Design an enzyme around this catalytic site. Structure first.
Site, PDB file in Angstrom:
ATOM      1  N   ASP A  78       1.794   5.549  -7.149  1.00 16.51           N
ATOM      2  CA  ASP A  78       2.918   4.651  -6.879  1.00 16.51           C
ATOM      3  C   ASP A  78       2.660   3.282  -7.512  1.00 16.51           C
ATOM      4  OD1 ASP A  78       5.243   3.493  -5.805  1.00 16.51           O
ATOM      5  OD2 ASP A  78       4.498   3.472  -3.745  1.00 16.51           O
ATOM      6  N   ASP A  80       4.315  -0.174  -7.641  1.00 17.60           N
ATOM      7  CA  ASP A  80       5.331  -0.902  -6.864  1.00 17.60           C
ATOM      8  C   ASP A  80       5.656  -2.284  -7.452  1.00 17.60           C
ATOM      9  OD1 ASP A  80       7.017  -0.413  -4.533  1.00 17.60           O
ATOM     10  OD2 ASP A  80       5.915  -1.988  -3.486  1.00 17.60           O
ATOM     11  N   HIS A 115       7.193   6.099  -9.623  1.00 17.98           N
ATOM     12  CA  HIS A 115       6.287   7.135  -9.132  1.00 17.98           C
ATOM     13  C   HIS A 115       5.805   7.961 -10.311  1.00 17.98           C
ATOM     14  CE1 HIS A 115       8.721   7.012  -5.133  1.00 17.98           C
ATOM     15  NE2 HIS A 115       7.867   6.008  -5.225  1.00 17.98           N
ATOM     16  N   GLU A 139      -0.785   2.243  -5.690  1.00 23.28           N
ATOM     17  CA  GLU A 139      -1.192   3.126  -4.593  1.00 23.28           C
ATOM     18  C   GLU A 139      -1.430   4.526  -5.135  1.00 23.28           C
ATOM     19  OE1 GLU A 139       1.613   3.088  -1.237  1.00 23.28           O
ATOM     20  OE2 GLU A 139       0.162   1.807  -0.225  1.00 23.28           O
TER      21      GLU A 139
END
Length: 278
Positions: A78, A80, A115, A139
């Site tokens: 991830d 972000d 993603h 992440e």
């Protein structure tokens, strides 16, 4: 067309699908066969893609999601807050990452993140979460939680590739849900602070929260600091040098010196928190 996307076909082999709804700022996963909340560790609370799609419709949910496990080959990465208003990459480290790791990529639900799904294995020496100064974040997970699936393909990257993931060492911080247990505990006790508004004295809100953290973390100043950075009271000031230290470090030390009590899992003393909830 979502089902023609090769990556969606590969994930559609697994009966590890859920649906999600937005709550405030968080995305809670739901059981697609009975519309109840879903455990991300219990297999029979999930469904196949068809049941998740039927459940999406049936309960007016916000989107589909996929639950990662240690037995399946999928790794969820991830990125972000790495996209601008025209859906192009604004961050350099993200641009570097997408050159080095080319696999199925989609834009997040919010529209400002990405993603990446890869078939592989995470190296054991990197942290799940890595914050950057500008506001972006990395992440990485391969099990234990769910991932939202939009199907909004970024840059024609529609296929999940088998890749080496050693190169995440360049971006992610290295290590040598226990903090999250404290955060989750604090949230359901009403001890998680609101983001500050027009009238507030931010520096005073820091100290009240720092006092609370000292109790719940038990004067572990590094855990306090690691939890503070995830809270909505975080700002650049926290790391600005002040005297011989930082504003943040001086705030956390005074809180440790101030508070009389400490949280103890063994004694079960939730009520001993001397500060009332937000």
């Amino acid at each position: 067309m979502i089902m023609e996307i090769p990556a969606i076909k590969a994930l559609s082999r697994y009966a590890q699908w859920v649906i999600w709804k937005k709550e405030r700022d968080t995305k809670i996963p739901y059981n697609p066969n009975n519309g109840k909340k879903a455990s991300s560790t219990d297999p029979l609370a999930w469904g196949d893609i068809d049941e998740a799609q039927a459940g999406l419709v049936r309960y007016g949910a916000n989107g589909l999601g996929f639950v990662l496990t240690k037995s399946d080959p999928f790794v969820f990465i991830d990125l972000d807050h790495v996209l601008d208003e025209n859906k192009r990459v604004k961050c350099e480290w993200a641009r570097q990452l997408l050159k080095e790791i080319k696999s199925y990529t989609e834009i997040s639900p919010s529209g400002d993140g990405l993603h990446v799904v890869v078939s592989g294995k995470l190296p054991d020496y990197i942290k799940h979460k890595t914050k950057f100064d500008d506001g972006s974040a990395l992440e990485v997970y391969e099990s234990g939680r769910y991932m939202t699936i939009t199907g909004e393909v970024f840059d024609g990257r529609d296929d999940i590739k088998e890749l080496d993931l050693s190169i995440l060492g360049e971006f992610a911080e290295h290590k040598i849900l226990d903090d999250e247990a404290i955060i989750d505990l604090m949230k359901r006790k009403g001890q998680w602070p609101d983001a500050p508004k027009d009238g507030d004295d931010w520096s005073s809100l820091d100290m009240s929260f720092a006092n609370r953290l000292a109790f719940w973390c038990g004067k572990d100043i590094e855990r306090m600091d690691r939890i503070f950075r995830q809270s909505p009271l975080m700002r650049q000031k926290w790391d600005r040098p002040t005297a011989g230290s930082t504003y943040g470090r001086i705030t956390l030390k005074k809180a440790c010196d101030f508070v009389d009590s400490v949280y103890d899992p063994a004694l079960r003393n939730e009520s001993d928190c001397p500060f009332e909830p937000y």
